[PDB]
Paper text:
R2 elements, a class of non-long terminal repeat (non-LTR) retrotransposons, have the potential to be harnessed for transgene insertion. To insert a new copy of itself, the R2 protein recruits the R2 RNA and nicks the bottom strand of the 28S DNA. Using the nicked DNA as a primer and the R2 RNA as a template, it reverse transcribes a new copy of the element – a process known as target-primed reverse transcription (TPRT). The R2Tg element is a member of the R2-A clade common in birds, with several differences compared to R2Bm, which is in the R2-D clade.
Residue numbers in the entry: 220 to 283, 293 to 330, 546 to 585, 594 to 1108, 1124 to 1390
The structure:
Amino acid sequence: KVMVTVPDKNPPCPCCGTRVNSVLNLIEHLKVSHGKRGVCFRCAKCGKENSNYHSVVCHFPKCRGEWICEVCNRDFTTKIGLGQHKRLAHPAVRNQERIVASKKPFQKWMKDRAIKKGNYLRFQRLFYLDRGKLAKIILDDILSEIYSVFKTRWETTGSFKSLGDFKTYGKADNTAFRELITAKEIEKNVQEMSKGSAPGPDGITLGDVVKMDPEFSRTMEIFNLWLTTGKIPDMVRGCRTVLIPKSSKPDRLKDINNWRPITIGSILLRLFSRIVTARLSKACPLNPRQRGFIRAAGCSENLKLLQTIIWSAKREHRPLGVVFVDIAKAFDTVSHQHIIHALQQREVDPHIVGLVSNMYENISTYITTKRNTHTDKIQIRVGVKQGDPMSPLLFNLAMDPLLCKLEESGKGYHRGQSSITAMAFADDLVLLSDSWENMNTNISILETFCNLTGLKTQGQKCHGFYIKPTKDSYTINDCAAWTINGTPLNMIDPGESEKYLGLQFDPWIGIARSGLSTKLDFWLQRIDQAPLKPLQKTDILKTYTIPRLIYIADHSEVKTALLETLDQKIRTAVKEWLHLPPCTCDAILYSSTRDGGLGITKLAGLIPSVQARRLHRIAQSSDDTMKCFMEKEKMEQLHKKLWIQAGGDRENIPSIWSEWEAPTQKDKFPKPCNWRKNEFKKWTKLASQGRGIVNFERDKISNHWIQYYRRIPHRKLLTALQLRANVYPTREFLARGRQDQYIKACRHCDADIESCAHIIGNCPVTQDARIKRHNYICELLLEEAKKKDWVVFKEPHIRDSNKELYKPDLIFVKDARALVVDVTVRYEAAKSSLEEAAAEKVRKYKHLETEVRHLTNAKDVTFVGFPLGARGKWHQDNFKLLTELGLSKSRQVKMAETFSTVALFSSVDIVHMFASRARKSMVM
DNA sequence: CCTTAAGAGAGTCATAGTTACTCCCG
DNA sequence: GGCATTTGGCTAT
RNA sequence: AAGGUGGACGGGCCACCUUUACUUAACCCGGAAAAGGAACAUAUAUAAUUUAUGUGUGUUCGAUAAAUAGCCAAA
DNA sequence: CGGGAGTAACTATGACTCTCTTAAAAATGCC
Ligand SMILES: Cc1cn([C@H]2C[C@H](O)[C@@H](COP(=O)(O)OP(=O)(O)OP(=O)(O)O)O2)c(=O)[nH]c1=O
Ligand SMILES: [Mg+2]
Ligand SMILES: [Zn+2]
Ligand SMILES: [Zn+2]
Ligand SMILES: [Zn+2]
Ligand SMILES: [Zn+2]
């Protein structure tokens, strides 16, 4: 890296030995003239280095063992410190020690111009057609074989023989199938279906079903005919198959097993399957160990349960075995006769079992690939369809007797009177044991079930570890590896980790190191290197990039220091994209878009409230056995800490401890505090950058341009953002607090303070621009007066009784009414500024009643002031004038947005004019 | 036509309090 | 052609 | 050296020329940047590896990927 | 094998000191 030594505020460039004005001008010269993005700064007193300049200048004023680690030559004073160092910094060395102690002519440069213009065209096209694909392209860098493998996979009947001694969780409730399908039940399920999904081979989509049959009458007769006959017709049995990749890496895409066959059926069959699955899910209660596809947040509960069990086994000095398995090709391998036998064990109503058997009786499908080429027609004789609404319920009913057997005769891990042998989330299964030899009993139960039903386990995803207590602390994997189907398992050694439900588990520490920082750096660099405009980059970060962090940051329980590190990185990236000064307030970034902000998410505000709500959600779970393994006191103390740290009230903390037509209901657990309104409240308390911000608090009209900025140039947008934050670089802003060395006077006149209010409102160099602004606003109001057939006396000359001259802008005459309107554009600096502006523009002409009467031959005369804010404030009382003119309710809102946008960007034009006549006059 | 100001954030560094242990006598 | 209305992301399997 | 145009535009930097001429390789930063690019289909021509070579004219470079749950945000 | 006593590296709060130039809306639905 290029190395710069900084005690001195003005160093030279090392590429040419030539000095500049400041370190910021050096970074400018290194970036532009040489492309040297890798810069490192050194403290002159002590030789400390960092990549960050501001680190080194904060370093400069404050600038000032008998026992040896055999791994890294670190030195320590006591052996206790050495053992603690080897515990923290060197896992699996300490573990071994604990075990041991037990049409121009040519075409050349125009090609490069064509490539650059084409890259810009592609990204600007995708920003307005499909922004989700643009986010994926920025962030993620993403015939005979298919026919032969999938044809030999699907066509052969599975190897199920019999369930044997395996028994399901209780008998069924046959009352659910009694009452007929109503049209409102169909309406509720159509509201709960996915909104924009693909059609089947018959080509009808869900919106077409609504258009063909609005009241759901015809589909009701069709679905009840299917339900009482108990057989589906042959016209829906055909399906299509589309392949989805399982991993983004090109190293994996050649292998056929990393492609997932998604089978899509008819829309009416799919809706009918969801309607039947609701009733069959009511009829068949599952074993509570199964947390996948049910109406619960199973991921949070399973991660919390595994984390608490791993922590508690260490703290109570008890042995604990953990094994992770999952089923290979889980939906594709399950036999139809297995599902039918599982339904018959429950004594489900035989008409319903006949219907379920009939729906899988003659399914056939064809695979499409290479965008529009198809293979044959393949009989589906094994497996449920991935993408049919009924298949998760059928897979859960097929996997239920294994979980019941593991509860019944598996040797689990105890706490008090209760025990846990198994945990399930879909096909993912975790086995727990209180001893090493007990896991062989659990594994042989799993082997017996896989031999009876014909299922198989993915050997690539079978892992495990064993914790064994000692006098002080514990050892990991001081044993032989377990074997499932002969092959030994991958025993997870300390310091290494494997995935479980998206997070990673390490036996040494629990839920492993997050790695969010490297992902955030990588994503910010890829957003920066896209050919996009700055607010487009800000929108890619705002909407798509930041929600990817929230699940991992929630469930791994990240504390505040890493959150504020990520927040610092985010807001430095945003302020460097938008060309804002580093001293710009945080609240323009963090307030809501209707508050006048950008709507970027503060992690240190959002994440502790999400974690606190997660703990409250887990504590009110219906799973009564999981709550007996919860560490009650640590959960209450952690909820208290997260409630206080999120900004909640210390004194009001919560304590955390027909049927077919009613819409689905959820509990909404209490939220600590509204952090975004707290950001806006601390914006209004600033002295200079918060001046007049209270005008824009909930005005959806004045902040319309921050959302819909499409037809505005970005120079004008960034100057509007600088004028709203009051961080535009006039000389008053270049002084601020640094008052000893700089001049605050105006460049063009003798006025003492060169504020932005001086430039916009009062300075004599911008007088023609203010006159043209006022005239254009009066023309915009005049055309709306013309459109409703008002006769306009524009700019009269009225001489009063004392022969003084007055000039109102507009008089509007219709049906003996006369409306005297006077327009002004005031820079807003208080909550009451435009109201006083309207009052003083009323007060200027109120005596002129009778003169306006004989001028316009009118009977009734009213006088109205029409103020506008120079930074886009729409005054609320101007709707009275617009509704007296008689505009419709939508057209008033649209005109209000037009007036506010015109006033703001004409003030931007005034500020640009002042900057231009300032700069270009320097030579003459 | 217009009527005039008010540093804020980034960054280091010190103090002292948890967490998960380590090691040695009665 | 007036008038009104409404417009999102992410994770697990 | 000095006056110039050229590298879409502004700032750098480079190439070319000599009172407006020679004609242009290769690049950086940006608040500027909507195809003289790539894959195909198809007409036409030459010197048949014609599944060629050289031009022209049009499509595309996006969604067309389904399911069951859950969370966050606005409301 | 209980039970003091003692750390490494996080965590959580205050209290400072540092920095200050990139031109010339829109798609769908209803009256
Ligand atoms: C990931 C995924 C899974 N599923 C269902 C189908 C799967 O059979 C079941 C379990 O998924 P997985 O275990 O992730 O997939 P798999 O076991 O079928 O593939 P592999 O053997 O290579 O691991 O969840 C979906 O329906 N949609 C999805 O997007
Ligand atoms: Mg699987
Ligand atoms: Zn240099
Ligand atoms: Zn130093
Ligand atoms: Zn070491
Ligand atoms: Zn002035």
